[PDB]
Structures are given as C-alpha cells and as structure tokens.
Design a protein around this ligand. Structure first.
Ligand code: HEM
Ligand SMILES: CCOc1ccc(C(=O)O)cc1
Ligand SMILES: [Cl-]
Length: 393
C-alpha cells in the first residue's frame, strides 16, 4: 500500500536541489517508505500538518532526529523541551514562552533595530560584500549573544555548536559523524555558559534562571533550557535572514515592492521562511499503530516530516515556487505547528523584520556578483557564501 523510494533526503545531491525529489515524494502518495534509512516519510502539507498536531501519537521524547532514544544513547542529554512530550514539556515551554515574550520583545526591539540599520550602513560603505558572512551571520552575532547575556570570549564556538546540533538530527552519514567527532570543545564551551554565574543580568539566560523559583522549573533544569536557546537561537536566524536576502536578490521585483512599502518587511521575512524553509526536516516516533493518509504505520516507527516540501505543496499553496511578499503565509509550517511550534519565533521575526526594514529603506538593488556556494547540513538549508553588490538608495 505504501510506496518505497530510494531517495536519500540527506544526500548532498538532494541538498543541492531538493525540489524535484520533493515533488516525487509528494506525488508518490500521502505516506512513503524511505528504504535508505528505514523510516516513513510525509511530504504533503496535510499529513505534515496532521503529524505535527498529534503529539500523543507522534511523539518527540524518542528524539526528533533519525535516532530512536529508546534504542540508542542520545549524543547529549535530551532537550527538556524539544525532546519532551506533554506533560513533561508543558512547564519548560511555558518558561521559555515567557522569557521570549511580547514584553521581552519590547525591551530589545530598539537595540535590534539600531544594530540592523548600522550593519546595512556599514555594508553600503563596502558595496561588494558576502551576504552570508557579512550580513546573515554578522548581524545575529552582533545582537543575539549579547541578548543571551554571554561573555565575549568563546563566541566563535556558537555557530560550530549549532551546526553540530542540526547535523546530529540526521542519519549517521559523514556530515553527522564528522560533526560529532569535532564536538568536544564546542560542547564544553556551551555547557559552561549555561551556568547561572556566567550569564549577565537582564539577558535571556539570567531570565531563565530567574524562573526557577516559581515551581515551573527547578534550578537543575535551567542550564539545559539555556542550552536550548544556544542550540536553536542563532543558526536558525542566520539561515532565515540569508534566505530572505537570497530571495530578494533573486526576485528584484519583490525588493522593489518592499522598498515602496517597508511595512511589508515582516511578511517579506515570513514568506522567505516559507519559501526556503531554513529548517527543512524533523522526525517524530509513533507511539502506537496509526492510520495516516489511508496508510497504516506500526508502533515505534520513525516518521520524517518534510517541512520545506509542505511549504511548497501545490495542494495547499497557489504558485508555491514564487516568492511573494504579500502572500497570506499563515499556516506555513516553517516554524512548525502545535505544541512545539517555535517558541523563539518572536525573536526570529523581530530580527528578520528589522533587517529587511533596514534594507527596504537604504538599498536600491541587490545583485549577485560572484559564485554562490551552498552550505550542507542534515537539517538546515542555506548558503555558505552569497556575494552581492549592494546599491544605495
Ligand atoms: C527563522 C528562524 C527559525 C526557524 C525557521 C525555526 C524553526 C523551528 C521549528 C520548525 C521548530 C519545531 C520543532 C519541532 O516541532 O520538533 C522550532 C522549535 C523551537 N525553536 Fe525555533 N526556529 C527559528 C528560530 C528560533 C529562535 C530565534 C529561537 C530562540 C531564541 C528558537 C528556539 C526554539 C526552541 C527552544 C524550540 C523547541 C520548542 C518546543 O519544543 O516547544 N528558534 N523552531
Ligand atoms: C529548529 C528547532 O531547532 C532546535 C534545536 C535544539 C533545540 C533544543 O536544544 O531544545 C530546540 C530547537
Ligand atoms: Cl552539549
């Protein structure tokens, strides 16, 4: 009943151009079996959405990578939020939700915006820049570690640590095994900075620790929650902003619409998240026999959700392959959906918004003027290098 496919969604060939293979995965059926890794796959919007929204049947506590925590040792202590199910999940989630709240956004907004304006000003002085190193990396590096309350020393460990985390959700290919074999210094650094004494007052980190006396989390839980933010909070935004600039570079008509109305910045970023889906994939594990899209899946099976594919499913989206900054994006699954839906999305959107606003007001054109190089990662989609010429407005 379930078609079997030999496509490796974690191969460099796939990362290099995933879209044909994603259509093959969607059109093969609502549920496929991926023989390469012995997992089920869902690539259409409807099934991806259904799976995300049934956490009881499709759990996270057995890991959201290929590895089944019931069978293998997790490479690091499990995340108390990403790799937990309700009810264990519920209070740590509530804490990070309050730490990364509307009120918090109000306190950091002017600073994040000034930094974005300053960066664009600097880049315009240079003219010819690398929009990855000099913008998509440099801008989040200039605001997020400080917002966390990290010391200056050791920050060069943060992106390596993130690349390791997102590679480790993958199968045991070379990407994953190389990451893990280089991991020790990055782990050591990150774990140390998660301790209360090492986090500056007023940062996200200290704020997590301040929540330890409410009964929601205990003091021994706070370091792992800080670890979640240091895992997820940077490299995601790097690839989101990189995606947005790439889109604007490839669709000059949309840059021009954004210039004429900079208040489109926020949606222009959201559309970039749907269109590129910097977070491509996550797994769930079935806790029982389940029927999905008229197909039956046994208990304890890994299920691979293609978020990027769901965000380009023509069953859900009109002209999915077009970057449209006035699209109604609501419902896209680039931040996930349901109880695990990105708890940091207000930070991601804030960063993305103020950067695209700065570009909207200051830049007249973005032209690719060098070879584009992709960055390969088992979970993240994005570029290594994006050489562009920026023309001032
Ligand atoms: C454009 C940037 C980002 C994208 C595309 C993104 C994507 C996602 C996705 C798809 C999930 C769902 C995982 C699942 O269902 O298993 C998620 C969860 C999560 N994200 Fe984000 N993320 C981004 C930025 C951030 C930022 C900036 C932070 C923190 C400051 C963050 C922290 C987290 C955490 C802690 C979770 C786990 C939430 C839970 O399990 O309840 N992310 N993110
Ligand atoms: C795209 C979401 O990525 C992550 C990665 C790690 C964690 C965590 O360590 O809790 C959460 C989300
Ligand atoms: Cl670690």
């Amino acid at each position: 009943t379930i078609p079997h496919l030999a496509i490796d969604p974690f191969s460099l060939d796939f990362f290099d151009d995933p879209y044909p293979d994603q259509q093959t995965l969607r059109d093969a059926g609502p549920v496929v079996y991926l023989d390469k890794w012995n997992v089920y796959g869902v690539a259409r919007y409807a099934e991806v959405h259904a799976v995300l929204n049934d956490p009881t049947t499709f759990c996270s506590s057995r890991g959201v990578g290929l590895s089944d925590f019931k069978k293998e040792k997790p490479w690091r202590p499990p995340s108390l939020i990403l790799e937990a199910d309700p009810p264990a999940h519920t209070r740590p989630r509530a804490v990070l939700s309050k730490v990364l709240s509307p009120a918090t956004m109000k306190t950091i907004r002017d600073g994040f915006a000034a930094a974005a304006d300053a960066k664009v000003d600097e880049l315009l002085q240079r003219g010819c820049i690398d929009a990855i190193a000099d913008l998509a990396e440099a801008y989040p590096l200039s605001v997020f570690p400080d917002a966390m309350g990290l010391k200056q020393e050791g920050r060069e460990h943060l992106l390596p640590y993130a690349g390791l985390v997102f590679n480790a959700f993958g199968p045991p290919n070379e990407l994953r095994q190389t990451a893990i074999e280089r991991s020790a210094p990055h782990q050591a650094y990150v774990n140390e900075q998660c301790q209360r004494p090492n986090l500056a007052p007023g940062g996200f980190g200290a704020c997590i620790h301040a929540f330890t006396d409410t009964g929601e989390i205990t003091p021994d839980e706070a370091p792992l929650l800080v670890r979640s933010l240091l895992s997820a909070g940077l490299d995601t935004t790097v690839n989101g902003i990189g995606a947005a600039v790439y889109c604007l570079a490839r669709f000059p008509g949309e840059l021009q619409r954004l210039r004429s109305d900079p208040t489109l910045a926020r949606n222009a970023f959201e559309e970039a998240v749907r269109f590129e889906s910097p977070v491509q994939t996550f797994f769930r594990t079935t806790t029982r026999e389940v029927e999905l899209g008229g197909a039956v899946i046994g208990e304890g099976e890994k299920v691979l959700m293609f978020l990027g594919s769901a965000n380009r499913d023509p069953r859900r989206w009109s002209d999915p392959d077009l970057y449209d900054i006035t699209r109604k994006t609501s419902g896209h699954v680039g931040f996930g959906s349901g109880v695990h839906m990105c708890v940091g999305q207000l930070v991601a959107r804030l960063e993305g918004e103020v950067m695209l606003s700065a570009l909207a007001r200051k830049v007249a054109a973005i032209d690719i003027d060098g070879p584009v190089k992709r960055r390969f990662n088992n979970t993240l989609r994005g570029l290594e290098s994006l050489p562009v010429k920026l023309t001032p407005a």
